[PDB]
Design a protein around this nucleic acid. Structure first.
Ligand SMILES: NC[C@@H]1O[C@H](O[C@H]2[C@@H](O)[C@H](O[C@@H]3[C@@H](O)[C@H](N)C[C@H](N)[C@H]3O[C@H]3O[C@H](CN)[C@@H](O)[C@H](O)[C@H]3N)O[C@@H]2CO)[C@H](N)[C@@H](O)[C@@H]1O
Lengths: 88, 272
RNA sequence: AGGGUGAAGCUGGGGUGAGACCCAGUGGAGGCCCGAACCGGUGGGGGAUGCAAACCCCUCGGAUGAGCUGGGGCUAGGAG
RNA sequence: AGGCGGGACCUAAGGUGAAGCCGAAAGGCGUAGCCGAAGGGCAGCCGGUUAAUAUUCCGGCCCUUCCCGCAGGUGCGAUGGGGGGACGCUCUAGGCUAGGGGGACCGGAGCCAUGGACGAGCCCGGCCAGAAGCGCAGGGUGGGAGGUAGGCAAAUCCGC
RNA sequence: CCAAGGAACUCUGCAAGUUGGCCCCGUAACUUCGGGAGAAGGGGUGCUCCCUGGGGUGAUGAGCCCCGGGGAGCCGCAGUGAACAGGCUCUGGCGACUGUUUACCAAAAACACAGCUCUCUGCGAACUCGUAAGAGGAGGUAUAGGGAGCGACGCUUGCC
RNA sequence: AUGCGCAGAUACCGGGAGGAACGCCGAUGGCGAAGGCAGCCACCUGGUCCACCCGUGACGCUGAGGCGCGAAAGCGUGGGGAGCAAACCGGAUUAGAUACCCGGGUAGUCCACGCCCUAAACGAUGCGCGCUAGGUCUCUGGGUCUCCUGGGGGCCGAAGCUAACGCG
RNA sequence: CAGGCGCCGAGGGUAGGGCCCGUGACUGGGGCGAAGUCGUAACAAGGUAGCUGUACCGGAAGGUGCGGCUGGAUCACCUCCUUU
């Protein structure tokens, strides 16, 4: 489940600069990761509509933030796109 | 090696409502098996309607375990035969030889199970009643020891263990009744393998039924020259009679039949 | 004989969480659909001591299924 | 007609039937072994010759088992255990003759009748069988060793 | 073979003629969204020469099969040129539809039937033949094997 | 009445089977977009409250359309029915009683996967922010925790709002 | 120049569909004109309170079960407003 450690490690791989204790980068890393192992679970289950739901809202959130990502700058952004994989 | 029930062809003209089933072992049976004559005609006089055939394999299956009462066996795997209401497992006995046996609740290829003098009450092994953990399930079960697996609850998921008394344990049998068998006798552990089958749907009758092998039945079939009942007209007769000089369909058959009182009670009925 | 039809599975592309499910390609199943050999035999017509103790013609239905067919057998006649 | 076929072999349905169960009698039922099939299995083909028959005759080419021997080689040695020959239907890739088809392609007996064309014109044919040696395709799997508490009663063979 | 008229003949358009070969344009109420569609209604094709693409075969170059595609044009009343080859639409009762039969009139309802319900039998089941014997049944074993009235399916099966 | 019992029940004792439910604790109490959600245990999960002020850098509020979500009833196949139980059958009723009562018993009620979205769906009152006395209680996070502070629930409650309640 | 050649289409015909109109025994039905032949839910706990979504049964209003929304009367429990 939620492995804090490795977590921070990637918050790291991403946060271009070691001083990103909360940045678009991370909103990204995080919502992503979560979204994914979470969802995978969703699959082998089929009925937890409540949490499915939340997950929903969440994914929204993340994507939208990215929205802004583009808004100001999608450049570095597309790089992100890249690094990650999502939206292809 | 289980099997799909539901697959149904679709609108391939009136071939409508045709239910498929597919055991996955799909292998063609093995070494131990002859074939049956073309009975329907028999003792050379001829008898009982329907009857027709359609292709030809024909079985030999194990009905008796006390004959190795122990050599673990591992599911050779699944498969079946042009007979039986609920597939089989060709099983492998650790000693080399194998045997076509039941096919209780969805067990598992390679699974080890066996039976005899104390078998683990795990659906799959079999045991002398007595090892009956009262409240459990089996089938195949046989009263009068040695008289082989007597009461082969076909796809008959039905041997419900219901208490004991004397040298006989009580059982709830398909039918909706409770008989008794002296404990030393035996039961295949667990339950059957098929039922949905029982629900299977088949297309253009002629086609299906016949394929089944069976042709027909046609009552008070006009010209009641015989056909017990009336005919030579529309109207359904009255008397209240059936084919070959019959008693309708609401009368006994049993008797002293020392058989009867001897065990079982519940008397013959259900109520779904 | 021959020809059209064009399911299921699958493969890929499409949309959620995965998925439904879609589209497309593959596919090419029984019903079959079209229609000879094959099997039946209305619809009309042609013989009345007719080619004939049940026919010829024009025609017509099925044309993989409860299909058709040669060989070998068992049930039979108050029984089949 | 040793080599085509059928028996000199196999067996299902299926009939018989030593046993056995059974009828007032005559019979009814019947394992086993047997009888019992263009269903199994098995060793040749092509060219030539009679008024007339043929892969049966003749001839060329290719084998078949069984007996006597000899030469080389081995636990050889039942048919009883086993493995094994054995199998739908629908469809269907890949690979070879049959078998179609144009060769003016080579052999040949002839022709324009008729206004014409002798000109890749017509007309006829241009193969079939061949130990195996060999080159296309594929077509049908495991070596061991050991444990080898089943064996499929009796033992290295199968199967765990 | 007909014309003039084109069913009034006629109990019935019985029959017979219409019509029918593939390719493109296009296609109704209803629907178990499989389909009723070969609906239906048009139009096409023959043969010439010209520009233009393709799947064959040892690349691929006299070696062939698919459409090409399009263009200009040729001759008939006429161009699946002859023989194979739908008349059609609307609508109603029954029945589902595949079917078998009625050998000798009775293409077709009836009987099938899939699928409904009642209900019968504990297996040495219950019946069916049998003088026992015995087989059958079922090496099946109550989701199974019989007696049945109905007969997809949809709504629905009330009163004694 | 009734229906069930001397072919012994109704009560008491022991044992058997299974379905459902889940007491006290448990609350005027809690979590959830809503619906609605509870014997404990474990697997995976989501909303969400407080404090350091550390990160980013306004990316945010709204949501026609759609998209997924969910009462109970009922349908679909496949399980299952201990009890309860429209329907049905009785018995009691009045003049009538198809219903209010007692005696019965199906479907359903329950599980899986699919399907209906249904509404006095309620606080009959859309969401998002910020401005205006206090008093009280109760649960919950932080503290110099006679209390204070962020959050969360009922209660009293100036101004004020309304045709009037009553909101506060 | 005449005509010839070419589509062009006003126009009409045959076939088919679409929008709306009228329209048809019988028919589900809708609204009302003081003085009617039946019972009577609902509002007083309207006498099983009701109301509702759903399901099912009935001369009819309606009853019944599933679930729920109070726009449900009387004691018994506690918090909180005032007060002789
Ligand atoms: N049509 C209205 C609907 O049906 C009913 O109304 C109808 C009905 O009640 C009422 O009928 C009433 C009866 O009752 C009452 N018991 C006797 C009375 N004579 C009769 O009157 C009726 O017949 C009269 C004959 N001289 C006419 O004048 C009068 O217009 C007519 N209503 O009149 C309405 C007819 O239109 C419901 N009452 C109402 O609630 C619902 O909305």
């Amino acid at each position: 489940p939620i492995t804090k450690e490795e977590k921070q490690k990637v918050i790291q791989e991403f946060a271009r600069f070691p001083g990103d204790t909360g940045s678009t980068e991370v909103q990204v890393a995080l919502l992503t990761l979560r979204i994914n192992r979470l969802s995978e679970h969703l699959k082998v289950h089929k009925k937890d509509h409540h949490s499915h739901r939340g997950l929903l809202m969440m994914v929204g959130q993340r994507r939208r933030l990215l929205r802004y990502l583009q808004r100001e700058d999608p450049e570095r952004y597309r790089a992100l796109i890249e690094k990650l994989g999502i939206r292809g | 090696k289980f099997k799909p029930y539901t697959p149904s062809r679709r609108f391939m003209t009136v071939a409508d409502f045709s239910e498929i089933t597919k055991t996955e072992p799909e292998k063609s049976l093995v070494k131990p098996l002859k074939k049956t004559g073309g009975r329907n005609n028999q003792g050379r006089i001829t008898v009982r309607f329907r009857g027709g055939g359609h292709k030809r394999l024909y079985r030999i299956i194990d009905f008796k375990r006390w004959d190795k009462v122990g050599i673990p066996a591992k599911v050779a795997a699944i498969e079946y035969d042009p007979n039986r209401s609920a597939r089989i497992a060709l099983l492998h006995y650790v000693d080399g030889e194998k045997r076509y046996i039941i096919a209780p609740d969805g067990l598992q290829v390679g699974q080890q199970v066996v039976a005899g003098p104390d078998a683990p009450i795990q659906v799959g092994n079999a045991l002398p009643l007595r090892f009956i953990p009262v409240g459990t399930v089996v089938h195949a079960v046989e009263l009068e020891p040695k008289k082989g697996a007597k009461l082969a609850r076909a796809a008959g998921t039905s041997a419900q263990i219901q208490g004991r008394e004397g040298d006989y344990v009580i059982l709830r049998l398909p039918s909706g009744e409770l008989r008794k068998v002296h404990g030393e006798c035996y039961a295949t552990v667990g339950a059957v393998g098929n039922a949905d089958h029982k629900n299977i749907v088949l297309g253009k009758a002629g086609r299906s039924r016949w394929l089944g092998r069976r042709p027909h039945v046609r009552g008070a079939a006009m010209n009641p020259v015989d056909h017990p009942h009336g005919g030579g007209e529309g109207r359904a007769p009255r008397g209240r009679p059936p084919a070959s000089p019959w008693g309708w369909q609401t009368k006994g058959l049993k008797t002293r039949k020392r058989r009867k009182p001897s065990s079982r009670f519940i008397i013959a009925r259900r109520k779904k």
